[PDB]
UniProtKB/Swiss-Prot annotation, chain A:
<dbReference type="GO" id="GO:0022625">
    <property type="term" value="C:cytosolic large ribosomal subunit"/>
</dbReference>
<feature type="region of interest" description="Disordered">
    <location>
        <begin position="1"/>
        <end position="25"/>
    </location>
</feature>
<feature type="binding site">
    <location>
        <position position="22"/>
    </location>
    <ligand>
        <name>Zn(2+)</name>
    </ligand>
</feature>
<feature type="binding site">
    <location>
        <position position="37"/>
    </location>
    <ligand>
        <name>Zn(2+)</name>
    </ligand>
</feature>
<dbReference type="InterPro" id="IPR001569">
    <property type="entry name" value="Ribosomal_eL37"/>
</dbReference>
<keyword id="KW-0694">RNA-binding</keyword>
<comment type="similarity">
    <text>Belongs to the eukaryotic ribosomal protein eL37 family.</text>
</comment>
From Swiss-Prot, chain B:
<dbReference type="GO" id="GO:0005840">
    <property type="term" value="C:ribosome"/>
</dbReference>
<keyword id="KW-0689">Ribosomal protein</keyword>
<dbReference type="GO" id="GO:0003735">
    <property type="term" value="F:structural constituent of ribosome"/>
</dbReference>
<dbReference type="Pfam" id="PF00832">
    <property type="entry name" value="Ribosomal_L39"/>
</dbReference>
<keyword id="KW-0699">rRNA-binding</keyword>
<dbReference type="InterPro" id="IPR023626">
    <property type="entry name" value="Ribosomal_eL39_dom_sf"/>
</dbReference>
<dbReference type="InterPro" id="IPR020083">
    <property type="entry name" value="Ribosomal_eL39_CS"/>
</dbReference>
Swiss-Prot record, chain C:
<keyword id="KW-0699">rRNA-binding</keyword>
<feature type="compositionally biased region" description="Basic and acidic residues">
    <location>
        <begin position="89"/>
        <end position="112"/>
    </location>
</feature>
<dbReference type="Pfam" id="PF01280">
    <property type="entry name" value="Ribosomal_L19e"/>
</dbReference>
<comment type="subunit">
    <text>Part of the 50S ribosomal subunit.</text>
</comment>
<keyword id="KW-0689">Ribosomal protein</keyword>
<dbReference type="InterPro" id="IPR015974">
    <property type="entry name" value="Ribosomal_eL19_dom3"/>
</dbReference>
<dbReference type="Pfam" id="PF25476">
    <property type="entry name" value="Ribosomal_L19e_C"/>
</dbReference>
Length: 56, 46, 143
RNA sequence: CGUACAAGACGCGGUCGAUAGACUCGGGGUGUGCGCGUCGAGGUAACGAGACGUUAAGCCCACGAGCACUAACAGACCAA
RNA sequence: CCUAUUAAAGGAGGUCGUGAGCUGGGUUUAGACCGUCGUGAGACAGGUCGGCUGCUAUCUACUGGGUGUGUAGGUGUCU
RNA sequence: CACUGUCCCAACGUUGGGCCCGGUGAACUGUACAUUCCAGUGCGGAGUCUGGAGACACCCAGGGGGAAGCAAAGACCCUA
RNA sequence: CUCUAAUUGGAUGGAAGUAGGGGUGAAAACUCCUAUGGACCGAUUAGUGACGAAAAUCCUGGCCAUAGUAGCAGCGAUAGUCGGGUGAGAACCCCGACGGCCUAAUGGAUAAGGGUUCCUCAGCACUGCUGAUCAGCUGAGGGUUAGCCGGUCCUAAGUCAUACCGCAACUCGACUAUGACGAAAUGGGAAACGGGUUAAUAUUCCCGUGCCACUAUGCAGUGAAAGUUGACGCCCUGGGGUCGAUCACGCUGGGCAUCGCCCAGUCGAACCGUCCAACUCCGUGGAAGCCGUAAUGGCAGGAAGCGGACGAACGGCGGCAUAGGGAAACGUGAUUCAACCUGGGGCCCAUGAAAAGACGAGCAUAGUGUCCGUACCGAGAACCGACACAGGUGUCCAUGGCGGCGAAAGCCAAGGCCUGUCGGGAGCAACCAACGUUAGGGAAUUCGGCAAGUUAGUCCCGUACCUUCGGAAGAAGGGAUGCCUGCUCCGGAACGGAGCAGGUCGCAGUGACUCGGAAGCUCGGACUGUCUAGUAACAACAUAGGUGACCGCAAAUCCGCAAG
RNA sequence: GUCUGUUAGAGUUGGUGUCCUACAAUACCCUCUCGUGAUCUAUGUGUAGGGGUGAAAGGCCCAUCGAGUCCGGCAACAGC
RNA sequence: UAUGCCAGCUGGUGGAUUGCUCGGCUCAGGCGCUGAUGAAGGACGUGCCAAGCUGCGAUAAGCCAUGGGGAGCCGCACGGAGGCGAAGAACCAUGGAUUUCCGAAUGAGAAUCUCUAACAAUUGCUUCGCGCAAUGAGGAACCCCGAGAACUGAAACAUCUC
């Protein structure tokens, strides 16, 4: 069985969903953690300096 | 699938949001819904 | 005129497969104006809308064959497709036979024809497959 | 319409006509039709695989002949 | 190399003609074994089993078929 | 051993394409020029240079000889 | 070439730019004329630079040839045709007839996922492999109704939060406590059936009938928690038994018309009541060889027989029902029996969940039963795969008829469809795909019998070497096979099976379909099993078996910075 | 961890067939192997990047694997 | 002369060019904290007709007061209908009202909803009662305290360097 098209047909699982805290469709309903703002993981908001160029 | 009351409100909004730009707004602005969506061609969140 | 909607409604009111409703070729206009189920029933009453009959396969030919075979015909070597044990389940056949032998022996005992120990002796012989059938058993019993 | 042919081309006939089809003969292919009658191992009977006769039958033909019945009509145009 | 026939069963060139013609047995990836070598990873101008063959032809080339112009109304036959 | 179109050696037929017509309608590829052929020459593997030969233009179909055809800045080899 | 400054000019009596054209300069370039344009533009000097392009498989945008070319054929699903309707327009939108296609699916119901794709009206610029009046498209409206179907409640592997401790530290980290979270088809679970109704909902609305829980009141009751249930693996199997299917006869209706056959229907729930086989047990009885099974088995530690207690169905029976449904009749018996119920046996170096809950624990009447989901698709067009993709995608309908061993083939119902959606022409050439048939020869072909073919179902006879005694073996080899008439045997019987005698047709009787070619020698790995998703299925990995090593548990081995 | 078997379902030996600007960035057809078990399968759940997972093929960890993906270091460095 | 080549003309296609600037880029000056009195952010509502943006929050392109302002107005947005304004509207300044749900998110739970009174959790004070208080999270960068690479340079490379 190929890894391409054949294996795409099996994809009907719901993981990432609208996040109650930031509104992005990044709340992983199985992990219960927003990969965007980190809701459900961090009381603080998910930030990272690499999300931008070093001198900016 | 099964939808929660909230998921329904959202889908509901996305449905109303999917409308024509009122005929009159085109006159008032002396001559497009850039967010127009299709159930098949597009994909909503969730 | 497009009568698809009506066909669907008529299939539900006449309650038959959609493919069996007949619409009179000369009354499309009227059927076309039919909007509600009531309109359809009305048209059903008039006969403009009807349901063709469902089919049922004939078993006449099968019946003839069923007789020939019940009479023991059409089962020669050239007609058999399944292995012998498949045409007649052996364990099943044995259950049939041994029960018929044990019953026989049971009637012959309460009937006084066989003493308890005579019955016992035959019963165990039966259980050991000493008799091919009820008739074979009786033959033996007649010493 | 084919002695020709993937388009195009090529060839033949067009009532001063057998060019194609229908029809009928001929020449062919199968192999003895439907129905009916008799026979048929048997079977009370019903029923009955099948045999014989009717039947060199029935069915069929990209071929030939006869035959203007149908269709090649009506008619338009170029041209030193 | 070998066998039977044969008049004879010659040799060579064409990108060792010919894979946008074929085949894919040998060679020469990724798997694996053996022998030898190597402390080892692994190797071998050794052996062995398995292991893929893309493309709608633009030009040119040729095989066949047409339409035009030239020679300059036509039919037929020729050279 | 058996069997056979694998072969001697090919033939006929079937279905879908192919071909013609309506409609729809891409891509690959493109320095330029380009009707070539035989020789030669040249960075020693030329439609384009030289010398000859041949060549009226355009179009249809074809199987792919050539364009060291198209496709991917060779993965072999060496070098860093 | 840009913009700045100073000096100095041009422009609506027409600036810049652009197009075509004239003149100058070796040249970079300068300048004029005409048209267009319709508002800005220079020169000199000194500065300022994101200052000059033919090239980078350079970037972005636009455009041509390619070309009216390829594709719109190939898949075991070849599908249409003649009339007519609507319309400005009809091969493909609709009606009818005729002709076909799908049968574990091309039919029915659903999970996930999608999200309005669902229904109606009005449309065809867009989407649609051609067209379109059609549509999953466009515009506008509308549609999802629950005490008893899910969720909700329970706990599963496991997850998180808090506390504790670690960490330089945390959004990080293991344990231990606590709490919570974790099952929508498909784990457990209080209770709903039948019919009617709409364009679209429906055990939800309506009609009829029923049921459960909690609470209130009244009567009863003092029992109330021991126990039972929830609650369970794999293999074989008996008994009860419904739907279905079939057989017999009757009734209602339909079809066919030389016959006298063929088809459909003959209905009716939940619930309430009641019946009880098996298992278990008790009384009686008194077997020292009897009782019993498909099989195992049982017994003086008390067999059979007889009586009794407990005790089953989604099952029988009565009610429900002068409910409902049907144009009508509005059956009765039988066989085989899915479901469902209840037993017996065998297996394990394997032992087949938990919790909430329920029963235990009465009856009346009344009140309450909120919240969330509910449309549609579920696929060769509604999901994922960029697509209206020949791929992928869970569950159940596994009992419709013939056939046969069969949930096989083939054919046909119920139901669905002609949308695996471009058509029209040419005996329709070459060539290609996928096939059919080929005389004689018969592997000569080829690396190699690759490809194709041969054989084939069932019964009888018969069967070598070798062997771990299991096997080898369907070895090989040989024979039979239909139909019709009348019968025999086994069985309670089958519309079950096994045979006999006579008759008889064909080239051919597993007549299609279904359906092994066989034998020997050698190499390898013992075997079933594993693997390179996408060029390797093998001799490679695994395996049981064999062996060696470490360790007495505050152990050996291993993870973590630590807490662990 | 038996046999035959397109029962369901799992797989894929050969055709080096069809396709190879595909229906499809792994598809189609026939043949073939497994089909009561170390079986197949749905959902839920766990293991995470020098780390998992692996009946071991450097196999697999979302078309990506002899060290995933994203962004950042970053305008890395190169004698090519 | 067909098919055709080169240049131009008329008309397309295309959007370069010139002109224009509601946007950027950079520099300078000023100013500078918000949040359990629930912020920032997000969701969903909210208009006569309303999809986007903006505003606002069930009092929902707004309500109140004071001052300004002024004959007009009903946002972007040039429509239609209708309405408001001399009871001084619109508009502006300041102050106040209202301010759904999720969100540090704090009664428990949850993909923005649900379930049966709540400073959850950790603290200080303590009338030992959550009675009174505190912390939490946000912010363009700046700042302080900790953890801390590698590519790179050295023409290799390990200290060093980055
Ligand atoms: Cl039993
Ligand atoms: Mg037996
Ligand atoms: Mg060569
Ligand atoms: Mg070649
Ligand atoms: Mg090639
Ligand atoms: Mg090719
Ligand atoms: Mg000056
Ligand atoms: Mg430039
Ligand atoms: Mg071409
Ligand atoms: Mg419905
Ligand atoms: Mg389709
Ligand atoms: Mg040879
Ligand atoms: Mg008998
Ligand atoms: Mg050898
Ligand atoms: Mg093996
Ligand atoms: Mg592979
Ligand atoms: Mg071992
Ligand atoms: Mg260095
Ligand atoms: Na979608
Ligand atoms: Na070569
Ligand atoms: Na069509
Ligand atoms: Na059957
Ligand atoms: Na400030
Ligand atoms: Na306190
Ligand atoms: Sr899935
Ligand atoms: Sr967390
Ligand atoms: Sr951070
Ligand atoms: Sr899609
Ligand atoms: Sr090869
Ligand atoms: Sr001339
Ligand atoms: Sr060709
Ligand atoms: Sr520049
Ligand atoms: Sr083009
Ligand atoms: Sr077709
Ligand atoms: Sr095909
Ligand atoms: Sr039109
Ligand atoms: Sr529809
Ligand atoms: Sr729960
Ligand atoms: Sr359930
Ligand atoms: Sr099972
Ligand atoms: Sr039974
Ligand atoms: Sr439904
Ligand atoms: Sr499918
Ligand atoms: Sr049918
Ligand atoms: Sr179509
Ligand atoms: Sr023949
Ligand atoms: Sr050979
Ligand atoms: Sr040979
Ligand atoms: Sr034989
Ligand atoms: Sr695999
Ligand atoms: Sr097996
Ligand atoms: Sr191969
Ligand atoms: Sr083949
Ligand atoms: Sr391929
Ligand atoms: Sr098998
Ligand atoms: Sr970078």
């Amino acid at each position: 069985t190929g890894a391409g098209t054949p294996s795409q047909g099996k994809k009907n699982t719901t993981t990432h969903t609208k996040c109650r805290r930031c509104g992005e469709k990044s709340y992983h309903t199985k992990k219960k953690v927003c990969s965007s703002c980190g809701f459900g993981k961090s009381a603080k908001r998910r930030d990272y300096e690499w999300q931008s160029k070093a001198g900016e | 699938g099964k939808k929660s009351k909230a998921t329904k409100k959202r889908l509901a909004k996305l449905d109303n949001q999917n409308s024509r730009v009122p005929a009159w707004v085109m006159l008032k602005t002396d001559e497009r819904n850039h967010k127009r969506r299709h159930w098949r061609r597009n994909d909503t969140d969730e | 005129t497009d009568l698809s909607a009506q066909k669907r409604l008529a299939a539900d009111v006449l309650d038959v497969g959609k493919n069996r409703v007949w619409f009179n070729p000369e009354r499309q206009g009227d059927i076309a104006d039919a909007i509600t189920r009531e309109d359809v029933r009305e048209l059903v009453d008039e006969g403009a809308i009807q349901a063709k009959d469902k089919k049922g396969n004939s078993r006449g030919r099968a019946r003839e064959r069923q007789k020939k075979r019940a009479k023991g015909h059409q089962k020669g070597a050239g007609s058999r497709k399944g292995k012998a044990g498949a045409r007649q389940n052996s364990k099943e056949d044995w259950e049939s036979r041994i029960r018929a032998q044990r019953t026989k022996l049971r009637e012959l005992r309460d009937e006084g024809t066989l003493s308890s120990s005579q019955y016992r002796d035959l019963y165990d012989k039966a259980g050991g497959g000493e008799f091919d059938s009820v008739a074979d058993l009786e033959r033996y019993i007649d010493a």
